[PDB]
Amino acid sequence: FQRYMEIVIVVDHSMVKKYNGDSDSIKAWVYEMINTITESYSYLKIDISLSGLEIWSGKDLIDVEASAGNTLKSFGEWRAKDLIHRISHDNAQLLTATDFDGATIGLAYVASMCNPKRSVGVIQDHSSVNRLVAITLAHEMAHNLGVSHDEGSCSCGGKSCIMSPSISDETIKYFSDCSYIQCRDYISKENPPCILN
Ligand SMILES: [Ca+2]
Ligand SMILES: [Zn+2]
Structure with a gap:
């Protein structure tokens, strides 16, 4: 029943300029974000393993655009062309300081675990509160595992949970019962082999 997800976080150059080059x-x-999400995912019977952390200090390896959609596609393609031959992992997430146009702070492919160019997500380092950004990271990763937004009576001991369609500080860092169901149902039906090991 237990599954293991090997992840690689990629920090872009705008991020590096934001922290004044402080690695x-x-x-x-x-x-700290990984520490938070590790707990959230343990309750879904999925162990998170940080395989690697890549920082783009010199320059970006892809064109990061204001368009979240073009950025996700570029990143997924660079993942399949480069990163996968360097580090064995199951999913990769891009952390960027770019303000995506529209009301977009994160984006991911849906139900795409193990796919070379699609098991990826994109998240904006949108807040000074670490917990809020960590929640978005968990939210996009969940989209890769096939989960949809919470609605109606879905709860995590309160209603605003990780899969809420909006982020606020009233959001609890745990998944709702609905998220548990969808996630385990996807695992059940698709049984992505890369998260078995
Ligand atoms: Ca794996
Ligand atoms: Zn979402």
């Missing part, structure tokens, strides 16, 4: 500050920031 250790950026690592502390990402590590």
